[PDB]
Amino acid sequence: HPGFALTAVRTDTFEVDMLLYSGKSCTSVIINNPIVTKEERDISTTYHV
Amino acid sequence: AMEANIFCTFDHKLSIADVGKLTKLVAAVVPIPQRLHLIKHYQLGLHQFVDHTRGYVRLRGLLRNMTLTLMRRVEGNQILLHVPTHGLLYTVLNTGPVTWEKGDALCVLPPLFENLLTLGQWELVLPWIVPMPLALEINQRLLIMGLFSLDRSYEEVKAAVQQLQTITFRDATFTIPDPVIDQHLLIDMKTACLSMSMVANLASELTMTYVRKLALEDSSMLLVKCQELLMRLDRERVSPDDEIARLSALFVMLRQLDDLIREQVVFTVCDVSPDNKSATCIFKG
Amino acid sequence: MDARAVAKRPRDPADEDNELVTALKAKREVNTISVRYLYHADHQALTARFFVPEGLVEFEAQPGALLIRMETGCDSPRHLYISLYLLGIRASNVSASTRCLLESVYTASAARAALQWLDLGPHLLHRRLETLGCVKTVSLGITSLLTCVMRGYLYNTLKTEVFALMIPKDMYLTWEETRGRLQYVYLIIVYDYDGPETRPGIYVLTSSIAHWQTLVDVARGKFARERCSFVNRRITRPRQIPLCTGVIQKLGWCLADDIHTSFLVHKELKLSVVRLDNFSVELGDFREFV
């Protein structure tokens, strides 16, 4: 025995399934139409929606 | 709406494997000697310029003349090449020994070392695309290895050349080929080294006479310090037509160095992917 | 291949319906995505996006900052994208009060690490910095995103507003009493060979001179003391070979009447700048002069 008595602390991770409750129309979500922004690379183009 | 492409045709008959091999190069940098609309397969790539007495210096000088085209489409009986225009964005294949990163300035170099396509006594040797610092380092390595070429009887010199020969860059190391093959240096590298040494030698003797006279006048008090430095290097160790001849020789040797002294940027990079084989770049002429 | 087809005027690319509209019309399908107008379709500016940590994006959150790529000595974060402002802490021409202001703004591990990675190696600044374009968009985050312009104007998605290039005042140079209409913008790094450690100056120069040799002549006149420092070091200090007294690279063009003075507010600190109101980006490489 050395003269001291260490105390160890560690963190463990658990994989969890959660359930959520929310009320009817508890938040109103305002949206518009999805739009396309063009970004042309040369050999192919990418369209951002 | 169509675009202005170049048409290339092959005299050789192609197998399905050859065509599939071409379709993998649909963004490569294929140089052409002249701006033509219909060319034969022989004029693609550097294979037409290969010789067994010339080296990297000659091929670098020849590459600077050519027109750089990107392959665009591959089909039976045809290859479509696009000649890019300055300031526009293009996709280019990474074929050199080094990984590119965004913001790089790329330049075209002769190659120093499924596979690539050969048909007859034919081969599709594409140029190397590397960032500008790597090309500059490679050129300086080759020049110094050329200057050491006459002391190769000693092991100290050979260790020096083996240190010159290996180069390290972004997570890659490769060994450039020694310009000395069969114990003797090729004529193009020989001329490059001889011109470098001649410009140095001519400057060493010629500059003092002019520096004295012009430093007498120089209000910048810079040329006096220049003459002092010349006096120092002197201390460490002519007919007028001959003065004209030596000045003309100095400037002609400098013009001989011009191919190596400076290299052009042809692209600048902006794209990143696991697909790293390619990137999108803007073209520069 | 007939005269009617040769003499026919080209189609207007704006009157043609897009690839998406042509497909949806071909099958007569409908989509919730709206594909009639494509944003950024007629932008002639070439742009790229750079991801940068939160610590570097001070003074860059407002459009108009010049983005420079610095290479660290190490392998993992091989390059950092720093602005001309953070580079101003290294500059010698920046007044000590402005330098204290900048140092008070950039107080994160990323910015101080950028400065350390700069001062640590032996290379000069320019053999260590690659110039990207100027910036116009920011989304904030612990790893932030900046869109940068490689060749073009700086403007909104609809070109409804056009951005200027911001130069910190101590870095701004002008060399003619009266400016001509069109003037080109250069970035100059000039090295002073005083004593133990080469001291750099960082300048941004607007001049109508486009020819290289004339510009290098007037620069050699304006920086004669640095040239004398270079040769005097070469004589006094052998075997430490210096290269370049300075480097010039061209990074844009502008109109003489679009130069105005302004201030940038950040952390309630005001940094006074010189602005180029319709700056166009057109980058060259570094040219070294002696």
Swiss-Prot record, chain A:
Location of the protein in the cell:
Virion; Host nucleus
Stated family? Belongs to the herpesviridae major capsid protein family.
The entry's function note states:
Self-assembles to form an icosahedral capsid with a T=16 symmetry, about 200 nm in diameter, and consisting of 150 hexons and 12 pentons (total of 162 capsomers). Hexons form the edges and faces of the capsid and are each composed of six MCP molecules. In contrast, one penton is found at each of the 12 vertices. Eleven of the pentons are MCP pentamers, while the last vertex is occupied by the portal complex.
Subunit comment for this entry?
Homomultimer. Makes the hexons and eleven out of twelve pentons. Interacts with triplex proteins 1/TRX1 and 2/TRX2; adjacent capsomers are linked together in groups of three by triplexes, heterotrimeric complexes composed of one molecule of TRX1 and two molecules of TRX2. Interacts with scaffold protein; this interaction allows efficient MCP transport to the host nucleus. Interacts with capsid vertex component 2/CVC2. Interacts with the small capsomere-interacting protein/SCP.
> Any idea what this protein is called?
Major capsid protein
Source organism of the structure? Human cytomegalovirus (strain AD169) (HHV-5)
Curated annotation (Swiss-Prot), chain B:
State the gene name recorded for this protein: TRX2
Quaternary state and interactors: Interacts with TRX1 and major capisd protein/MCP.
Q: Protein name, please?
A: Triplex capsid protein 2
Q: What is the source species?
A: Human cytomegalovirus (strain AD169)
Molecular function (Gene Ontology), one example: structural molecule activity
List the GO cellular component terms: host cell nucleus; viral capsid
Report the protein's function. Answer: Structural component of the T=16 icosahedral capsid. The capsid is composed of pentamers and hexamers of major capsid protein/MCP, which are linked together by heterotrimers called triplexes. These triplexes are formed by a single molecule of triplex protein 1/TRX1 and two copies of triplex protein 2/TRX2. Additionally, TRX1 is required for efficient transport of TRX2 to the nucleus, which is the site of capsid assembly.
Q: Which residues form the signal peptide?
A: none
Q: Which family does it belong to?
A: Belongs to the herpesviridae TRX2 protein family.
What subcellular locations does the record give?
Virion; Host nucleus
User: What residue ranges carry the coiled-coil annotation?
Assistant: none
| Domain of life according to the entry | Viruses
| Cited Pfam families | Herpes_V23
From Swiss-Prot, chain C:
Q: Where in the cell is it found?
A: Virion; Host nucleus
UniProt cross-references to InterPro entries, sorted A to Z: Herpes_1
Sorted alphabetically, the keyword list is: Capsid protein, Host nucleus, Virion
A Pfam family matched in the record:
Herpes_VP19C
**Cellular component per GO?**
host cell nucleus; viral capsid
- Swiss-Prot/TrEMBL GO biological process terms: viral capsid assembly
Taking the record's annotation, the residue ranges forming a coiled coil are none
Q: Could you cite one Gene Ontology molecular function of this protein? A: DNA binding
What subunit structure does UniProt give?
Answer: Interacts with TRX2, MCP and capsid vertex component 2/CVC2.
The family assignment reads: Belongs to the herpesviridae TRX1 protein family.
What function does this protein fulfil?
Answer: Structural component of the T=16 icosahedral capsid. The capsid is composed of pentamers and hexamers of major capsid protein/MCP, which are linked together by heterotrimers called triplexes. These triplexes are formed by a single molecule of triplex protein 1/TRX1 and two copies of triplex protein 2/TRX2. Additionally, TRX1 is required for efficient transport of TRX2 to the nucleus, which is the site of capsid assembly.
Which protein, by its recorded name, is this? Triplex capsid protein 1
Which species is this UniProt entry from? Human cytomegalovirus (strain AD169) (HHV-5)
Q: Which gene encodes it?
A: TRX1
